[PDB]
Amino acid sequence: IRSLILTLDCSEAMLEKDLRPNRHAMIIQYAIDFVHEFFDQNPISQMGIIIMRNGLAQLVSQVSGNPQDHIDALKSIRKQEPKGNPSLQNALEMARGLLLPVPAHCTREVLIVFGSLSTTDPGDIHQTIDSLVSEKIRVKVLGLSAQVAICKELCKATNYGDESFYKILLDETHLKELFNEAVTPXXXXXXXXXXXXXXXXXPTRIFEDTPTFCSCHSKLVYGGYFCPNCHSKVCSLPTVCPCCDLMLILXXXXXXXXXXXXXXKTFAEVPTTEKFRSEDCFSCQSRFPXXXXXXXXXXXXXSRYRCEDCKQEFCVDCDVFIHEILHNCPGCESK
Amino acid sequence: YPEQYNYMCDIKKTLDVGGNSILEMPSGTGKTVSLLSLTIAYQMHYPEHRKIIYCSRTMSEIEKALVELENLMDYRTKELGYQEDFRGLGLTSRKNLCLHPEVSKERKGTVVDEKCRRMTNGQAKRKLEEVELCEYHENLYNIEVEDYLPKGVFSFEKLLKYCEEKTLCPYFIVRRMISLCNIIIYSYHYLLDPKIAERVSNEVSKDSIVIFDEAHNIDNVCIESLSLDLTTDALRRATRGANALDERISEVRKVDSQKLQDEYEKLVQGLXXXXXXXXXXXXXXXXXXXXXXXXXXXXXXXXXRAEHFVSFLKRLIEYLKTRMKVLHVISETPKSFLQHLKQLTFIERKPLRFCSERLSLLVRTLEVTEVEDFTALKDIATFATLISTYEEGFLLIIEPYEIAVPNPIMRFTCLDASIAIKPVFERFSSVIITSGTISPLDMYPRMLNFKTVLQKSYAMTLAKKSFLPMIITKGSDQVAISSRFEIRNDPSIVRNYGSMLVEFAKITPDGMVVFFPSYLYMESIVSMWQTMGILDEVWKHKLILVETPDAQETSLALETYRKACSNGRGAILLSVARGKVSEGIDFDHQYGRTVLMIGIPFQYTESRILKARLEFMRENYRIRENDFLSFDAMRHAAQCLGRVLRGKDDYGVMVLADRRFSRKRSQLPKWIAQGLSDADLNLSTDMAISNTKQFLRT
């Protein structure tokens, strides 16, 4: 579904002490949490880490659905020192060579964490921006403080003529907010194209560990997933089986689709003097008054979050709890 | 916009009441404000009434006024669907608006008019007694060619492509279209021209609306209209020019003497009035503004011929070599110099009429006239016209003994600048006087006395997008007063000043333009800067404007500066605030987002031209040692202020050094004083708040 290509700046501009302790020690650290934010909500998606060091582009993490491959790839970058200059043309041309195995049915995304202010590209960088629109590659650049005129054209021409993707970060708290929105998908208006995907087999949970069985490694294992097509007991994963090119997901894709179909109905916060109901919660027991600023002009006023799907009173605490996980408002399941 | 309607309601109230209005406009936000109101005031009155007359200061503002008029016609043909009587004429230069010197001559200089008169008289020689015409003559004055402009807009670039496809001439189309009177776009060097404006004023035939565009260097054009230097090499041209007239009088009196004898009787009867009336489509002579000189009933060397007129001229040039052969510093009164001339040779009081008739005579007499010889005669004849009349405000100065080799340099000082601006008030009414680089505008009621109204810029909003700070302490507040002196005192401080520029450019490496009050400060640090980290890790390439800035060098430094910011590089534009190319094009991120100024702009003092104009304006307006160091220093700084304000959509930071800027005013006076190292953390915030407040105010 998704095949994100992480583009990290690893140059001498990241040696500055803007963040704590520096820019490179927080970019690598927050990206490990972004790997955890990506494979949980999207367990059947892809990731790819491309650094920009010494005026080139180095591939440290291959495109794979295993999250541990991107963790250990980022543990080796923090050991060395970011040197050189960023190369946006070599990073995008390397991102083009990996998204060509990615089909048109899977969405191709490129995220650029650009903390520098000057890059070193070989040829014309405008020939690389127009190539990402020809094969439809959604590029998003996260610039630090000042804005670059190159990233304005990159986050607009590759994004259906709309410049709203080149975001400017100003704090480490705001940098984690960018990793929460990038973990979520981008359900845009698209270009109205056809879509049809098949060949999705089911993994049989096998636990044979006497003399073991491994079709993707030929080693000892404590139980692997059996493919429903080639009948191979490879590694237990919700991705594709490496013997007949068939999937092996289960309820992991159903949980991602349930979150994708989650519209999250926010409860309408009506006052206790306006909704004509007592202070109560449909999820728990919020028997305390919300508003209590003034004497009796606010304490008797209060607020009761009335969800319009079942006319159930709630508070402000469980209205964000029902929209985060599970189903939006538990009164919707009862008629 | 509502702020653009505030100046438009003032333009709709002054064009139908006042005769001249000093309207102040903000920078980068007043171009199309008066453009649409000029076509709306004509549409509210009559569309064939008073046409629009535009007076730019550069050729770029002539080119920028043509594309905005296309947007006015596109807004009138899409929102209305009716194609009315079109107008608009691109009156540009002669070397640019040509076809013949771009094919065979391959020269883009000032000699394009010499091949023009050779083809005009060559077509006249092919249609009288007999080279011939050119590529496309005897067809551009047709009625179908006169209708190619009210039907289709073909001005400058659209007309140069039209004269190649239809095979026409760009000179005879535009010259025949001043009489049609359209929306005429031209610069300040044509309205106050003593060889062009005498021909322009006879074809517009008045009754129009003059639009003064960027009217802040009006006092500079009136000085540039005169003041010619005589650096002794013209005496070698006048010596060889006098011997050429001796051979020409020997050639005229050897065979065909009836052509000069009948011209002598035509000058003894029809004089200069019939001589100018008979002469058509030929090379015109020179005069000191015939619409301002006003002289009639002349005589040809007191009923004499060309043989007696060249004897007075050879008597004249040796006296000029006698007066130039002097000591050093010596001033001259133009009336007392004429009295010392009459003690040498009685040349009466009218040599103004003794030269303009003989200049037109030698064109009709000598057919193979030399270029350097006849131009040497026009340099004397222009000086002979200025010593005959116009002595009030005039002054003759001599350059001193400056090694002395380069010492014989003679110059005449211009008169009052109000005299050149005088005939534009009685010829045209409702003259819209607009400028975006003026703060304040009270010197224009003072200097150049004319009765007008004063309107300021009523547009100031969104101060969070227009960062206007200023630097005071440069770490020690020593290099601010160090750049104040004219001479480069203490170059170690300038090396410390140039060390701060590498620190200042490395903070924000996203488009940098650095102005200078003189090229001496640019040449002082370029010899041994010992600091190229910004020229190898920040701005990389260097765009430094030299003192002898070539037109191709200024063009190549401008395009590569646009190529630097369009590749994620950034460049340093080291220009001169007193130099050429005042710019004005921005409204994008390709321009320098942070503009640096080295101190305050200064003027070249201790010069005879400045000391003459100091005592001249001391008797006029009593503004001695005030406006000369402040009103002139503001307008050279206001050209740097017109580039940062590129509309309300684009941001920009303009820092100013020293402390003498607080005594003057500025466009949108919202300025906070801080140090140099303090503004490095302020501009890092201003380059991040403006990136977050852009989507918040929408």
Ligand code: SF4
């Ligand atoms: S007619 Fe026009 S193109 Fe031909 S020489 Fe004269 S100015 Fe040039």
Ligand SMILES: [Zn+2]
């Ligand atoms: Zn399989």
Ligand SMILES: [Zn+2]
């Ligand atoms: Zn509750």
Ligand SMILES: [Zn+2]
């Ligand atoms: Zn509900």
